[PDB]
Design a protein around this ligand. Structure first.
Ligand SMILES: *[C@@H]1O[C@H](CO)[C@@H](O)[C@H](O)[C@H]1NC(C)=O
Ligand SMILES: *[C@@H]1O[C@H](CO)[C@@H](O)[C@H](O)[C@H]1NC(C)=O
Ligand SMILES: *[C@@H]1O[C@H](CO)[C@@H](O)[C@H](O)[C@H]1NC(C)=O
Ligand SMILES: *[C@@H]1O[C@H](CO)[C@@H](O)[C@H](O)[C@H]1NC(C)=O
Ligand SMILES: *[C@@H]1O[C@H](CO)[C@@H](O)[C@H](O)[C@H]1NC(C)=O
Ligand SMILES: *[C@@H]1O[C@H](CO)[C@@H](O)[C@H](O)[C@H]1NC(C)=O
Ligand SMILES: *[C@@H]1O[C@H](CO)[C@@H](O)[C@H](O)[C@H]1NC(C)=O
Ligand SMILES: *[C@@H]1O[C@H](CO)[C@@H](O)[C@H](O)[C@H]1NC(C)=O
Ligand SMILES: *[C@@H]1O[C@H](CO)[C@@H](O)[C@H](O)[C@H]1NC(C)=O
Ligand SMILES: *[C@@H]1O[C@H](CO)[C@@H](O)[C@H](O)[C@H]1NC(C)=O
Ligand SMILES: *[C@@H]1O[C@H](CO)[C@@H](O)[C@H](O)[C@H]1NC(C)=O
Ligand SMILES: *[C@@H]1O[C@H](CO)[C@@H](O)[C@H](O)[C@H]1NC(C)=O
Ligand SMILES: *[C@@H]1O[C@H](CO)[C@@H](O)[C@H](O)[C@H]1NC(C)=O
Ligand SMILES: *[C@@H]1O[C@H](CO)[C@@H](O)[C@H](O)[C@H]1NC(C)=O
Ligand SMILES: *[C@@H]1O[C@H](CO)[C@@H](O)[C@H](O)[C@H]1NC(C)=O
Ligand SMILES: *[C@@H]1O[C@H](CO)[C@@H](O)[C@H](O)[C@H]1NC(C)=O
Ligand SMILES: *[C@@H]1O[C@H](CO)[C@@H](O)[C@H](O)[C@H]1NC(C)=O
Ligand SMILES: *[C@@H]1O[C@H](CO)[C@@H](O)[C@H](O)[C@H]1NC(C)=O
Ligand SMILES: *[C@@H]1O[C@H](CO)[C@@H](O)[C@H](O)[C@H]1NC(C)=O
Ligand SMILES: *[C@@H]1O[C@H](CO)[C@@H](O)[C@H](O)[C@H]1NC(C)=O
Ligand SMILES: *[C@@H]1O[C@H](CO)[C@@H](O)[C@H](O)[C@H]1NC(C)=O
Ligand SMILES: *[C@@H]1O[C@H](CO)[C@@H](O)[C@H](O)[C@H]1NC(C)=O
Ligand SMILES: *[C@@H]1O[C@H](CO)[C@@H](O)[C@H](O)[C@H]1NC(C)=O
Ligand SMILES: *[C@@H]1O[C@H](CO)[C@@H](O)[C@H](O)[C@H]1NC(C)=O
Ligand SMILES: *[C@@H]1O[C@H](CO)[C@@H](O)[C@H](O)[C@H]1NC(C)=O
Ligand SMILES: *[C@@H]1O[C@H](CO)[C@@H](O)[C@H](O)[C@H]1NC(C)=O
Ligand SMILES: *[C@@H]1O[C@H](CO)[C@@H](O)[C@H](O)[C@H]1NC(C)=O
Lengths: 125, 132, 107, 452, 132, 132, 125, 41, 48, 48
């Protein structure tokens, strides 16, 4: 249930970054994974998200096209590519997953909203 | 109702759990009951035995009024000669494996009591005025 | 057998006017009555089978109704293509006799 | 008047069908470790209380001569006899020249030229060395090729024999042929049933009684007896080419023995293959014989003639003659006494005439080892010798008779023993059974429609 | 324990009786239909055919509306070409075997009417009824 | 109803028709799902594979609330993330094969809500709220 | 769905003719086939009628006994072998097929009623 | 130019000329589809 | 009809199907005699 | 076995020159002790 993250760092604008979210414990195949960044002034805003079955990736209205989200059910990892950066993207990025345990009456809490330790990325000249 | 996944409970996932909580996994245990020269005739025999063991669980269930039913009510009294506690000490503090381990002798005489006092007794009452 | 008595043999009506036909019966036929069209030089084809329901390819002008002994055939719009001979034949007894024959000529 | 179709499930409706039938047997002869040629350890354990259910007002037609149970049984008998020999030794190096002398040694009273003392060159475990061993073969097993005459086996021109497995036993034990769930086996309980036609007393037993797969020609051995009278069952009684199966009201006891005290010697003919040969008979050498009680056989033949007067002619004389000719399975009476294959003369029994107005009958037998069973030219089996004196007590429960061409219409009926076809042996016990498939679905009109 | 004594007729016991008496013994010939190297092949080949014949019977009983009913009432009218006897010459003067040998050609017109024209209509009519 | 005959559709006959018209041919395709040694094992494994597939389909159908049911209504709500298109574009404008290609991703999810969030919940409510 | 019937000819009364109707396209074994003749004054007179399952044959009162009908389902051929002719039988004969297509709402027209083109039988002395 | 020479060797190519028009499909009778219909309590 | 998988590639066979059947007669102008040479117990070798 | 073969050159053949070989060889009989000396005609594609 520990969503450990890696990657990122300090990069000039126009660079390329990839964030790795290696998962454990929970079933990665049936989990709807997101990407939510926490920034000063605008805290915890949505960026991207991928479905559990299919390879349909839904993006936000402002950051569409500048991020590419991918998942691999074999290595149990989640990716987000950071190309064509802008200086408003200096934020800590949280890897989170959502799923509904379906017995629902067997599980008292059927909300599987798992979060992870964020990694801090910043962009400047 | 958007942006959330769906993860399902695995097979035998409520083996150690209370019977009231394990009564919501009947579809879980019932879905994986069929699973879709030398070294060819033994597994053919095993598949035939698995099919014939899938039956007599639908033929013992089917002769009573519980065919196609997961939880079935029966008009057969629970006498206190069998291992009986209150419903709070059965459905809330006790697993299904322990319940099968207590009544290991009386389950056979229950199946004889469900073919005699459930059917062929209420069935004859229906046969008193059968067709209108 | 169930004898079939039809309308008079000619009801020549100018096109564009609604034509009403009928054919009688001896005893009860219930819902099993059909209708046919034989053009000159062509084999016959059905219009209204089971006395209420149209066939495939037939236009909306051809309509039939009735039950028991008396049955009606209604032609909403008459066309020069619709020249032919009208028949009704029962299907509740065994001999399956046809109608007398009603010829409509184009004015 | 407003008749609606209704569905009934479980109606008593059957049609005739042919289907595979599995095996069932008693658990007493099933748990034993001694293996049988007729594999029985793979059979289903039988029901301790079988369900024999009588049907009232059911008149079904049976036909024992077009019965598929006999053909399925014969296929199973041939399959079992084929697969029981695969594990045993292939006797293909036995086909060598033989230097045989007649056993005129230490008794030779009437076994004049039957036993032959044959010495042959045989291979051993080492392929470059050869051994000189001897065996005592019968006259029926060897033939001359052109003192110490040169011989060879009777099979080596036609086939290569497979030695029978020394630990399996050719003992017939009862086999119950049972039909799968959804099928049924009807049973004709009529006592005057001749094998064909309608049977007024039909019973739907779950499956048949114990049918012992007995190998016999001209004398149907122990099995099912007739209930009231001696029954003659023929496909066409006015035909000269149809076998005449006879059942018996009372069984005729026959005692068959081999007075020789045989000795088995192991000849190792390769790396792990042993040829169990006849050694030396110690003691007395006598011809093997079967004796039938003359008082019982005369009354039994008298009951056969009396019930044969109805089918042919009530004043026509009935004469019993011996077999015409052919192969030894057809000419003589063959059976299986403890693994030793006899071929016994039947001229003593079938020699009588019958006008319409306490001893024993000794039958001189003839033991053969290399046999051609099921009349298959190309497969033979070598029966190994059994040491010691053997003795069988058996019930003659029937006959297989063949009628010659009727001389001057109906003047004299000459009946000779026949046999040869093994389907006639299973027909004496499967005549009363037939297999039907059951269709429980049935549609019938009533005045009740579905309540919507 | 009022009422003492127990004698059954046995399997197929009403085969010589008429249809009006053999239609009252349908439970006996339904419960006994399944009840749960060579001779390892024929035993295997027999208990495959025993399951196939039961499941073909239950599929053709479940595609019409008679899923688990011994006597099932349907909506197809009895056409006069199949039989012209007015009930009495069927239920009081005829056994089920003679009825099988009478309607043997029309076992596919009747079955198709039971399936397609009525049962596939009845489920769609129930669909439109429970739609609103 | 005297000079008429009997001609049926045939297996998979309405495969090119729309689902609103191919929803009333289900009994035609529900018949040929069952159809009743050297190289006798390809005829023996084929007669067990069909039995296993038919029994798997029947058990998957029966762990829902649909026992012996061709067109079975369930009150599992339809999700907008499985197919965004509405009515009169599904039943009048597509065949069953195109819909099967559309819904093949989410069929395990749909089977999971028909099992878990419906049946073992409706049957638990039947033995609780009702039938004490 | 085309019925190529043949036969006919000019024959003296008392002779015999064989009208063979060849069936293509439709299901011949499931169709209820009749015979309808047409002459001057006798508008579409019925001749014979044969079933699809079973071999029951029905004839008209005027032509009963003299005429015979048969079919082969493996050949898709229908025969009306005329015998003991009368001069009033001079008519054109239609090979008529009738069947209801029993999935009756998938078929909006659950009635075949396909008839042959017609061959002319002329008998006179 | 296009020079063509006869082939052979692979024996499967003889039966591809007879089995080109046939293919085997498995049939799934189960299907889910949305309507306005819901079951009773 | 000419059928191929990747007919632009030379490594794939070309299955041509004919419209009219070209009749071919094939014969062996020799009257051979089958001679059975027995090589073992129940075995034979048929030779020219 | 070691087939001792010669060219046929019988009748007039046709120049089937060197195609058929008349091979004589020692082959075992039904008895293991004795041997035969049989002859057979073999094609050139069969013999090396
Ligand atoms: C189904 O899944 C496949 C693979 O994940 C994907 O390519 C396809 O677009 C999906 N279809 C739908 C309708 O979601
Ligand atoms: C419908 O699908 C969405 C996926 O986009 C999911 O989040 C939601 O939970 C589904 N609805 C239900 C009732 O499960
Ligand atoms: C195990 O027991 C604990 C007792 O508090 C319970 O909460 C838990 O649900 C049980 N195990 C499972 C996962 O069923
Ligand atoms: C319960 O058990 C007792 C004794 O074992 C017995 O007398 C009684 O009949 C049983 N109750 C029922 C309903 O069978
Ligand atoms: C079982 O518990 C219930 C609590 O609702 C109580 O009413 C009942 O009397 C108890 N029965 C026994 C036998 O203790
Ligand atoms: C069931 O039988 C065993 C052995 O006779 C016994 O030890 C056990 O106590 C029985 N169960 C109950 C609930 O009495
Ligand atoms: C057999 O027929 C007789 C006379 O009709 C009848 O009395 C008897 O009940 C029938 N037997 C059966 C099978 O019930
Ligand atoms: C058979 O011959 C061998 C010698 O070849 C001899 O030792 C043996 O005693 C003989 N047996 C009989 C029964 O003559
Ligand atoms: C066995 O072979 C030897 C020579 O190796 C020979 O002298 C002897 O006669 C043979 N014995 C037979 C053929 O019985
Ligand atoms: C057998 O008996 C039946 C009467 O049950 C008779 O019709 C038939 O002709 C007999 N057959 C022979 C061969 O005697
Ligand atoms: C032979 O028949 C007698 C009856 O006379 C019987 O007791 C005995 O068991 C039979 N022997 C067998 C069948 O081996
Ligand atoms: C029986 O034989 C006679 C004369 O050989 C023959 O005419 C008849 O067809 C045969 N078959 C019977 C009676 O079934
Ligand atoms: C067969 O032997 C038994 C005893 O072993 C004897 O009672 C019987 O009389 C004998 N029968 C004959 C025909 O010798
Ligand atoms: C005994 O057999 C003789 C012929 O061997 C015969 O003449 C005599 O009638 C028979 N005895 C009886 C009682 O049949
Ligand atoms: C044969 O003749 C006897 C007279 O001795 C008589 O009793 C018997 O019924 C006759 N059998 C027939 C004519 O079938
Ligand atoms: C049958 O008996 C006669 C005596 O009349 C005899 O010549 C013949 O060889 C015997 N045949 C057989 C096979 O025993
Ligand atoms: C049988 O006995 C007869 C006369 O006793 C005799 O001629 C014959 O050779 C013997 N053997 C055989 C095989 O028939
Ligand atoms: C039949 O028996 C008599 C006296 O027992 C004898 O003289 C005659 O030779 C025997 N015939 C045959 C063929 O055995
Ligand atoms: C037969 O021989 C064996 C030894 O081979 C001996 O033990 C047995 O007593 C002998 N039996 C008779 C009846 O001579
Ligand atoms: C139909 O048959 C029944 C037989 O009981 C009879 O009562 C009835 O009158 C018959 N109906 C007609 C119209 O003949
Ligand atoms: C219905 O009955 C009539 C009257 O016998 C018959 O002509 C017609 O062919 C039948 N139709 C069907 C579908 O059985
Ligand atoms: C619903 O379906 C109709 C098709 O008749 C379409 O015109 C309409 O836009 C659809 N509505 C929505 C909200 O998709
Ligand atoms: C069923 O068909 C056969 C042969 O086609 C016919 O003999 C029989 O009379 C038919 N059955 C009915 C009830 O017409
Ligand atoms: C076969 O035909 C299809 C459709 O005409 C075409 O798309 C494809 O390229 C063709 N393939 C070859 C190898 O010609
Ligand atoms: C066919 O072959 C060409 C070159 O020979 C290659 O480039 C191509 O990828 C192949 N496959 C196709 C067209 O599917
Ligand atoms: C082959 O050679 C043999 C001599 O070994 C001779 O007998 C035979 O005729 C020859 N065959 C031919 C066809 O010349
Ligand atoms: C066959 O054997 C003989 C000696 O027995 C030998 O001379 C001859 O060459 C052999 N033939 C061959 C090897 O073809």
């Amino acid at each position: 249930a520990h969503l450990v993250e890696s990657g990122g760092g300090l990069t000039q604008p126009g660079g390329s970054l990839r964030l790795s979210c290696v998962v454990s414990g929970i079933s990665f195949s049936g989990h709807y994974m997101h990407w939510v960044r926490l920034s000063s002034g605008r805290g915890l805003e949505w960026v991207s998200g991928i479905s559990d079955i299919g390879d349909k990736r839904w993006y936000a209205d402002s950051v569409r096209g500048r991020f590419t989200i991918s998942r691999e059910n074999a290595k149990n990892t989640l990716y987000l590519q950071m190309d064509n950066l802008r200086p408003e993207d200096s934020a800590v990025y949280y890897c989170t997953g959502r799923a509904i345990l379906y017995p629902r009456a067997y599980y008292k809490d059927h909300r599987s909203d798992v979060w992870g330790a964020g990694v801090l990325v910043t962009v400047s000249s | 109702a958007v942006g959330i996944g769906a993860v399902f409970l695995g097979f035998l996932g409520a083996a150690g759990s209370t019977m009231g909580a394990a009564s919501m996994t009947l579809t879980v245990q019932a879905r994986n009951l069929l699973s879709g020269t030398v070294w060819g005739i033994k597994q053919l025999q095993a598949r035939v035995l698995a099919v014939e063991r899938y039956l007599r669980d639908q033929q013992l269930l089917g002769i009573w009024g519980c065919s196609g039913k997961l939880i079935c009510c029966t008009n057969v009294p629970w006498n206190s000669s069998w291992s009986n506690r209150n419903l709070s000490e059965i459905w809330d503090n006790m697993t299904w494996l322990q319940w099968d381990k207590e009544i290991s002798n009386y389950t056979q005489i229950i199946y004889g009591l469900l073919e005699e006092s459930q059917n062929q007794q209420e069935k004859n009452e229906q046969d008193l005025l059968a067709l209108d | 057998e169930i004898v079939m008595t039809q309308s008079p043999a000619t009801l020549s009506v100018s096109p564009g006017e609604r034509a009403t036909l009928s054919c009688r019966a001896s005893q009860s036929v219930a819902s099993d009555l059909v209708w046919y069209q034989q053009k000159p030089g062509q084999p016959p084809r059905v219009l209204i089978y089971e006395a209420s329901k149209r066939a495939a390819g037939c236009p909306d002008r051809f309509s039939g109704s009735g039950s028991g002994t008396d049955f009606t055939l209604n032609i909403n719009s008459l066309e020069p293509e619709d020249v032919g001979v009208y028949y009704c034949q029962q299907e509740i007894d065994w001999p399956l006799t046809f109608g007398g024959g009603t010829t409509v000529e184009i004015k | 008047e407003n008749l609606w179709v209704t569905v009934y499930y479980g109606v008593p409706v059957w049609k005739d069908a042919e289907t595979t039938l599995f095996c069932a047997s008693d658990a007493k002869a099933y748990e034993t470790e001694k293996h049988n040629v007729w594999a029985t350890h793979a059979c289903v354990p039988t029901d301790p209380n079988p369900q024999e259910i009588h049907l009232e007002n059911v008149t079904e037609e049976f036909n024992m001569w077009k019965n598929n149970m006999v053909e399925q049984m014969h296929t199973d008998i041939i399959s079992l006899w084929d697969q029981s020999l695969k594990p045993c030794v292939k006797l293909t190096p036995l086909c060598v020249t033989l230097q045989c002398t007649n056993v005129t040694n230490n008794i030779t009273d009437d076994m004049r030229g039957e036993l032959k003392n044959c010495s042959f060159n045989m291979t051993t475990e080492l392929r470059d060395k050869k051994q000189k061993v001897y065996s005592l073969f019968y006259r029926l097993d060897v033939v001359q090729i052109n003192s110490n005459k040169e011989y060879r086996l009777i099979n080596c021109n036609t086939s290569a024999c497979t030695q029978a497995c020394p630990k399996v036993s050719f003992e017939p034990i009862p086999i119950h042929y049972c039909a799968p769930a959804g099928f049924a086996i009807l049973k004709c309980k009529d006592k005057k049933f001749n094998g064909t036609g309608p049977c007024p007393s039909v019973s739907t037993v779950q499956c048949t009684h114990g049918i012992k797969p007995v190998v016999s020609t001209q004398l149907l051995l122990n099995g099912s007896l007739a209930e009231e009278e001696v029954m003659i069952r023929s496909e066409n009684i006015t035909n000269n080419a149809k076998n005449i199966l006879v059942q018996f009201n009372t069984p005729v006891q026959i005692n068959c023995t081999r007075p020789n005290n045989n000795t088995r010697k192991s000849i190792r003919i390769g790396p792990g293959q042993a040829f169990y040969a006849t050694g030396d008979i110690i003691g007395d050498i006598r011809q093997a014989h079967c004796n039938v009680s003359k008082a019982t056989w005369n009354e039994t033949l008298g009951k056969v003639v009396k019930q044969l007067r109805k089918h042919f002619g009530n004043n026509t004389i009935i004469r019993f003659a011996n077999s015409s000719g052919g192969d030894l399975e057809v000419t003589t009476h063959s059976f299986n006494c403890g693994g030793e294959f006899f071929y016994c003369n039947t001229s003593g029994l079938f020699n009588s005439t019958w006008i319409s107005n306490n001893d024993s009958i000794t039958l001189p037998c003839r033991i053969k080892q290399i046999i051609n069973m099921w009349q298959r030219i190309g497969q033979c089996m070598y029966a190994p010798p059994i040491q010691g004196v053997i003795r069988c007590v058996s019930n003659i429960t029937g006959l297989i008779l063949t009628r010659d061409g009727g001389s001057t219409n109906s003047t004299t009926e000459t009946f000779r023993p026949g046999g040869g076809d093994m389907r006639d042996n299973w027909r004496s016990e499967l005549y009363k059974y037939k297999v039907v498939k059951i269709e429980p679905l049935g549609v019938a009109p009533t005045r009740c429609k579905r309540r919507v």
